[PDB]
Amino acid sequence: REMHGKNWSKLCKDCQVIDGRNVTVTDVDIVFSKIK
Amino acid sequence: REMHGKNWSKLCKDCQVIDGRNVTVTDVDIVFSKIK
Amino acid sequence: REMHGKNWSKLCKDCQVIDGRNVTVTDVDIVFSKIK
Amino acid sequence: REMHGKNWSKLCKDCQVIDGRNVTVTDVDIVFSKIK
Amino acid sequence: REMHGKNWSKLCKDCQVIDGRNVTVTDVDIVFSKIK
Amino acid sequence: REMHGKNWSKLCKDCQVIDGRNVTVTDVDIVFSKIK
Numbered sequence: 071r072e073m074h075g076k077n078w079s080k081l082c083k084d085c086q087v088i089d090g091r092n093v094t095v096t097d098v099d100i101v102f103s104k105i106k
Numbered sequence: 107r108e109m110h111g112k113n114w115s116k117l118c119k120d121c122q123v124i125d126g127r128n129v130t131v132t133d134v135d136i137v138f139s140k141i142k
Numbered sequence: 143r144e145m146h147g148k149n150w151s152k153l154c155k156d157c158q159v160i161d162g163r164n165v166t167v168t169d170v171d172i173v174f175s176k177i178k
Numbered sequence: 179r180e181m182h183g184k185n186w187s188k189l190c191k192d193c194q195v196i197d198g199r200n201v202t203v204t205d206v207d208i209v210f211s212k213i214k
Numbered sequence: 215r216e217m218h219g220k221n222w223s224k225l226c227k228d229c230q231v232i233d234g235r236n237v238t239v240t241d242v243d244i245v246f247s248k249i250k
Numbered sequence: 251r252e253m254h255g256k257n258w259s260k261l262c263k264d265c266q267v268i269d270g271r272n273v274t275v276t277d278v279d280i281v282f283s284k285i286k
Contacts, residue, residue, distance in 0.1 A: 224261075225255050227263045240275070245280075245281045248282075
């Protein structure tokens with residue numbers, strides 16, 4: 071298995087994450103941006 | 107298996123995530139943007 | 143299996159996610175945008 | 179006049195206010211509380 | 215006039231205010247509390 | 251007039267204020283508290 075996550079694990083590739091319990095985003099022009 | 111997640115695991119690729127218990131997004135122009 | 147998720151797992155590819163218990167989105171121009 | 183507000187004015191007494199264009203309240207036990 | 219507000223003025227007494235354009239309140243036990 | 255505010259003025263007494271354009275309050279036990 072190229073990517074293998076077991077008990078409560080977290081994995082990502084080519085990823086943009088804002089993982090978190092309380093997340094607030096305010097008065098932003100662009101939050102995520104991925105260009106390819 | 108290329109991607110294999112087991113008990114309560116989280117996996118992503120080419121991903122944009124705002125994982126979180128309380129999520130608030132306010133007064134934004136563009137939140138997610140992926141161009142290819 | 144290319145993608146295989148077992149007990150309460152979450153997996154995505156080429157994905158845009160706002161996973162979360164309470165999600166509020168207010169006064170936004172564009173939330174998700176994927177162009178290909 | 180004890181209290182007199184004219185053009186687009188705002189006045190209060192013994193007051194609790196969350197005046198604002200975008201208002202979001204999340205995961206709160208008690209928002210307003212006034213005991214007398 | 216005890217309290218007199220004119221053009222776009224704001225006045226308060228014995229007040230609790232969260233005046234503001236974007237207001238977000240998250241994961242709070244008690245926001246306002248006035249005991250007398 | 252005891253309190254007199256004119257063009258776009260702001261006045262308060264015995265006040266608790268969080269005046270501001272973007273206001274975020276997170277993971278607080280008690281925000282405002284006035285006991286008398």
